[PDB]
Amino acid sequence: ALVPMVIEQTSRGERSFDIYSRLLKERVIFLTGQVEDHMANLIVAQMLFLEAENPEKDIYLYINSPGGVITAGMSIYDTMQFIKPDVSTICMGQAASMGAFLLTAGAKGKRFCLPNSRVMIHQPLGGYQGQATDIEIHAREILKVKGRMNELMALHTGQSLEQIERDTERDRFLSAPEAVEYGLVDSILTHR
Template identity: 65%
Template structure:
C-alpha cells in the first residue's frame, strides 16, 4: 500500500433521507453532490482527479448555468492530475466557486485560484502555499535530461496560471514559487489567489458575485484585510 493510501480507508458517513418511497441512504459526498458541492479533501492523484472531473462534468450536464462549489482541503499532489481538474474547471460552462477549508497547497493552491473570478474564498484559519513542482528521476543521462526539461516546462506553466488568475507579474510569481511560500487568508487575498475571507453563512446577500444560497458569507475584516492574531 502506498504511504498516502490511508485516507481512502476511512469510514464514509451515510445520510438517510425520508422520501415518498421511504428511506433512502446516500454517502455524504453523494449528498453534497446533490447540492452541487464537490469536496477535494485528499492529495491529488489520478484516481482523485478522475472522480473530481466526473463530478464537474455531471453537474454541468444537470444545469450548465448554475454555479458549482469546490471545497478544497488538500496538500497538493500530482501535477498532471491536478491540471486535469484545472482544465475541466475552465472548460465547463458553470462558474466553479472555490473555497479553501484547512489548506490549499501546491496544486491545491492552483485549483483554488483557478475558480471563477470573484467567487474564490478561504475560511479564516485556512493556509495557502505556492511553490514549484518537484520530481525524482533515474535512468540514463539522456532520459534524466528529458524529464528535467519537462519539470521546467511544468514550472513555467504553473507560474503562468498563477500569474493569470492573480494578476501578479509573471516574473514575481517565478520568484515567489522558487521556495515554499505560505500565506494566511489575508495574504492570499492580497496576492490575488482568493477574493474574500469568509467565516459564516450570514449576510451572504452583501457579497458581489456571491456563492449560491446557503453558502458561507463574508468575514467582517479590518480595512487592511488583516486577520486577528492567534491566541495561545
C-alpha cells in the first residue's frame, strides 16, 4: 500500500485508481525529488495528456525539489511554454536550483508559494577531466549555459540582467515574502 486506492462513482458506478491517477484527473501534477531524465520524461507526457483533454483549462504543478540536471529540466520548461493552457506553479517545501527555475516559469500572475517555503538560486555546476584541448571545449559550453540561464531568469522575473548575474554568484536564499518582492513568485497563498 505504498500508494492508496480511491473509489469514485461514474457512469457504471465505479472506477478504482491509486492516490496519484485520481489527482491527475483533477489536472494536478506533482514534481518532487531530483530533476533527472526518467522523471522529467513522465511529467512531459502528463502535460501533453492534459492539454489534449481540455485545451482551455489550467494545469496545476506542485513543486518540491532540491534541484537536478539542467538538460532534463529544459524539457518540461519548453513544454510548459509550448502547450496552450496555462500551467500554474505552486511551491511547497522547497524550490532550489533547477526547481526554482521551473517555479518562475509558470504562467504570469499564477506563480504562487506557501508561506513557510524556501526558494534558493545559484549559478550552474559541472566539471570535466581530459586533455587541455578538451577542457577548453567543455569549459566553454558550461559558460554558455550559465549565460542562457541568466537571460531566462531576467526575462521571467523582471530583474535586469546584471542584477541577476550578481545574485547568482553564490547561493542566495529567499523566504516566501522575499520571493514575492524579488519577482520569482507573484503571491503567497494563505488559506483556501
